[model samples]
Structure formats: C-alpha cells, structure tokens
Target: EPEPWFFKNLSRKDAERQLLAPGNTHGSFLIRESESTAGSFCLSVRDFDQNQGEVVKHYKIRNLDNGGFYISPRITFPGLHELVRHYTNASDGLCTRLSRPCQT
Candidate 1:
C-alpha cells in the first residue's frame, strides 16, 4: 500500500500550501513526488523558526546506488519507509523532527 502522506501529483507550491495550512504545527510534513524530476522526491516540512515565524522547508530526497535513500549525505536509509521512521523520531539535519503527516 502507498503511504498516506505520500502525494503523487502535488506541486512544490501546493505542497508548501498544505504544510502551512491551519492545524499544521511545527514538524508537520509530507512527501511528494518531485514535480521537476520523474524519479526524485521532495519532503515538505512545517517549521516555526524564531525569525521566520511560520515557514515551509523543503528537502530533496535522493537515491543511491545501493537502493537506499538519504536526505543528508551522512545519514541514509534502506527505503522511504525507514527514512520517515528515522526522521519522525529525530530531525537530524532537518528543520524539525517530523511529528505528523499532512493528510492526503
């Protein structure tokens, strides 16, 4: 089954809009199929930086030759499943740790 937060046709603008919607707290996030790249993916996160107030941060999730995924080159996961698992537990280099996923 496909992941709930994994949106198929969401554009960058739309993804940002969704993550910034009401009830979207800091750490709310979603994964979208990359609008510009066929095989790539994007991670949109809601962050409340002190200076920026409310903002949406986007990161590129890339695949490696080992069939793993990595948001930060230093930390890699076997799949998107584990990537979410890790990030939800800790932000690592992300703006914030993932708390909830935007409902699709």
Candidate 2:
C-alpha cells in the first residue's frame, strides 16, 4: 500500500508557510519541480469543506519560470488520485511525455 499523505508544520514567522497548518487533517496533494527553481516554482492546492465550501492554499519554493510545469489554482480535487487524474486528463500529454526519466 502507498504511504498516506500528511501536512508538515511550518513556523508562523516564515513568509512562505504551509497552506494546511498542523492539526488540519484534510488530505492534500502537491506537485513541484524535480529541481530547484531559485524560488520561481509556485504550488497551490484547493480542497473542499463540508461547511465552508472550497478553500485554497499556496506555497512558493523559488522564483523561476517553470514553463514545462502545468497546474491551476482553480483545479482542486478531494483526493490525490483525483487531483492527478484531473491534470493528466487536461495536460495535453505533457505529464506522460516527460523529457526524461524522473530521478526521484
């Protein structure tokens, strides 16, 4: 079986922090570059709530143009599988047509 996903706790002082803080148990999936972007890569995830409706969270690791990477702020799903499926279906072959084999 695959390991379950969990959120990492981040310090409040950090300008870029976790979208889902510690103790918030909603399942989430993140997609990021295989290499560092010098702070250009940005990732965002959206999830639903039973009471509050849709919620979004954004995180930035670096700032560089990640033209090959494809994602959206509006495209949020409930599970990891669902999120992957959404992108795979809409990626126009980008996800399957990787430039080379992934190292990690």
Candidate 3:
C-alpha cells in the first residue's frame, strides 16, 4: 500500500507560501488560527489549470468544536473521496463542501 500524503498542521500561512511559490503547480490548504478550540478545523484545496492558470477546482472542509462538520458548494473530483472519508471518520461524519469552476 502507498503511504498517504497529507499536508499536516497546514496553516493558512503555509498555504499562502505554497501558492506564492514560483512555478507552483496546484494545491491549497487552510485553517483558522483563532478557531483552535479543539475539534474546530478548516481546510481548502485548489486544483490549478494550465499549470496555475486558475483554480479549476476548489474544496473546503470545516469541523466544528461541537463535533459537527459542514461542507459547502458540493462537487466531485479525484483524491476527494479519501479526504472526505478521512475527515468524516476522524471527525465523526463531519461535513464537507467541494466547489470549483469549470476549466475553460
């Protein structure tokens, strides 16, 4: 089996850094620094087009401190199933949202 590749402890700062890096391919992650109230977590991912032309795909997940999860703008894509399962199970059926614009 292949080891999982996840951006652990991924802060908004780190996500910004990666997005600003030269020749950046595609990917994004974020979390609220002020919402570290145990069980509260948020994340986002972007799929770039034409090697960073634009965000062809965007995904987001939010975990509340109350053990509830919420997702917005539903969509689907590769590598998403794993993410959903991981967070949902880890957070106990936490909700998630996947949103993105069609590539042109």
Candidate 4:
C-alpha cells in the first residue's frame, strides 16, 4: 500500500487550474517526451471514489522502450483512518462497534 503522505494533496480547484494551465505542462497527465531511439514517456493522474467510501488518487509517470516499461512516482491512500471511514465505522464521533463483548 502506498503511504498517505505519498499521495499528492490537490484540491478540485487546484486540479482544474493545472488542467487548464498554458502549454499543458502543469497538469497530471501529459506526454512529456519522445524520441526515435529513447521511446516515449507519459504522465497521468487517476482519481476514484472507492465503493467502501473513500477517495483514492494516483499519479504515475511511465516510460516505454522496446516492449518494456517503467512506472515511477505512484501514490495511494494508506493508514487505518481511510479504512474506518470507508466502512462507515466512525463518523463525527459515532462509531460502529466491531463486536459485542463476550459474556462474562
């Protein structure tokens, strides 16, 4: 699992700004480079809200060369807080107990 800190912190507003930035140079997904001998490279961003109930996002840059590929700089949500929120176990001081106490 990727660490929470690894994920980029981007507000919807910031994302929009980058998406429209001049030259398409600032957004998450854009083909950055290509060469006859060196192959091509691309950068992209993916965002989704899991069924469990938390938002997830990833930023990746990929290089393609001679049927081989390399991906660097990826991120995902980590830590228990996301898990707890996803399941709706706790929200605003309300928690769903995991289990009942065993009889004494």
Candidate 5:
C-alpha cells in the first residue's frame, strides 16, 4: 500500500517538469537535460532521512529515444503497478508492507 500510495500520487506536467510528490521535507524531484539527447530530459528523485541527515535512495528516470522510460540502477517496469512491486520488494524497511490505510 505504501508503494502504491507513493506512485499513485505522483504529479506530472509538460516535458519541462514532473513532481514525484509534495509535502515531503526530505525528498525532491528534478528534471534536467539528458546527455543522450539534446532535447530529451532526465528526471531524478532523491529520498533522504531527515533524522539522520543523509540520503536514503536516489533514482533517475531516463527517457529513451523509443518513447519509453527506465529507472536507473538497472530496474525496468512497464506500468506503475510493476514499478511499485519492484520497489516494494527491493527496498529495505524504508518501504514496508502497508497493512492498513496510512494516517493522514
């Protein structure tokens, strides 16, 4: 549920921008020009631990010429569900199994 909840709330915009999420003090989303193409872009996500003052996870969304995208560190999924499943299983306790609704 945490994984789904994470991806389900992602925000998007035109080619210039997209946001992973908001209201997080220790996370950020950034878009920049990609080296592979002059026109395409690279999206990055950084997750940090506020308590420890250190970065926890960092991911990059690389846009391919084929009109597809891949998350760096060698993970690939066609859909959000598959992506969520991969991250849920791959991450340690940072991404725990959601047993119930998250508190707002």
Candidate 6:
C-alpha cells in the first residue's frame, strides 16, 4: 500500500502526536518530512517508556550523493520503502523494527 505513513509534508510536532496516539502501538512507526532540507527524511517510532510512561524515537534518513538513501553510515537503499524494509528485518541501529504504522 502507498501508505499514509509516508507523510510527505509532516512536521515533527504533529509527527509525535500521531505516533503517541491511542490507536498506535509500541512498534508503530512513520516517515515524515525533514523540515531543514528537502533531500532528507525522518523516521519516527513509538515505544513504551522507561523514563516516564511513553516514548518515541526519531531517526534521520540521509540523501546519497550519488542518488539513494541512507539511515546509518553502513547501509543504503534506493527508496524509503527498502530502507524501512531493512529496518523491519532487523532493529539494527533502530530502537525497534518497523511495524504498525502511525497512519493518517
């Protein structure tokens, strides 16, 4: 599915709201706009707490100079979906694997 999770214009302020919503899950995640630059994207994931009671983690997806995507220095992908798919395969550098989406 072309997901609502791929938020083209989402801001970090509203991104937190959607992930922290009651309908979302501990594994829920979404990708949104990086306000600073058009070449990058941001990943946000919902996770239960250790500090307060709830938490969400955010990661930045970097643009490849040769044209692709990268979340960490080690791996790169042709598109956001492939990158998210790899994270789903393993938490890797992420706090958790991608799962239930923070849909619109």
Tens digit per residue, CA lDDT, model 1, 1-104: 56767875899999988878886788888889888777878888889988979899888999877889889889888888789889999988787998988853
Model 5 segments beyond 4 Å from truth?
A: 1-58, 64-68, 92-104
TM-score of 2: 0.24
Ranking by lDDT: 1, 6, 3, 5, 2, 4
Candidate 2 lDDT, tens digit per residue, 1-104?
A: 23122122222222122434443323233444322334233333444567775444444433224332224444444444454455435443222211111111
Per-model C-alpha lDDT, please? 0.85, 0.35, 0.38, 0.28, 0.37, 0.82
lDDT of 6 at 89: 86
Number of the candidate with higher lDDT, 3 or 6: 6
The alpha-carbon deviation from the true structure for residue 65 of candidate 5, after best TM-score superposition, in angstroms, is: 4.9
**Tens digits of per-residue lDDT for model 5, 1-104:** 32323332222332112322333322333334454445444433444445755232323455545555556536555643454455445442332221221112
In candidate 1, the residue pairs with backbone N, CA or C atoms under 3 Å apart (3 or more residues apart, or in different chains) clash, namely none
Where does candidate 2 stray beyond 4 Å?
A: 1-71, 92-104
**Model 3 — which ten-residue stretch has the worst lDDT?**
95-104
- Which of candidates 5 and 6 is the stronger one according to TM-score? 6
List all candidate RMSDs to the true structure: 1.7, 15.1, 9.5, 17.9, 8.1, 1.5
Better of 1 and 4 by lDDT: 1
The residue-by-residue lDDT of candidate 4 on 14-60, one tens digit each, is 44344344433211232223322233332222222346332222222
Backbone atom clashes (below 3 Å) for every candidate: 0, 5, 4, 0, 0, 0
**What's the TM-score of each model vs. the native?**
0.89, 0.24, 0.34, 0.20, 0.34, 0.89
In model 2, what is the error at residue 74, expressed in angstroms?
1.0
Which 10-residue window in model 5 sums to the lowest lDDT? 95-104
Task: Give lDDT: candidate 2, residue 76.
Answer: 42
Question: How does residue 41 of candidate 6 score in lDDT?
Answer: 90
CA deviation > 4 Å runs, candidate 6: none
